[PDB]
Amino acid sequence: GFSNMSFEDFP
């Protein structure tokens, strides 16, 4: 149960 955090935050 994980997920990336360095995302660019898409619209």
Added chain:
Amino acid sequence: HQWQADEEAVRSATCSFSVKYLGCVEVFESRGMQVCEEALKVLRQSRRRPVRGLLHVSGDGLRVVDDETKGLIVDQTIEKVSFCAPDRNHERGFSYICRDGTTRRWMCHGFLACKDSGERLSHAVGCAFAVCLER
């Protein structure tokens, strides 16, 4: 041993192993980790045929180089996809979601570990992002 090689693996461009990229399916959420536990099943139904490649969890995006064609199939990125998410069936299946911005809708891709261990790829990716935001 394993972690002694996975530590610098993600830093390089290959921290995973053989995978089974089934393809890509459409979803309706893209706001949970359980959304992947369902998509993985959809691709297991039909249409989207699985592929035997080599997942390389790189700190600058994943890359699946086919081990029978070496033509590559997943040239996406970790910071490009919404967020990773495992499963609760046997920890032998993972998937990532990718909403609009390239698909004009919610599309989640699914795959499975051809190693069957839930550590050669799972924990590996869980450390990729931690290094992706090192700077």
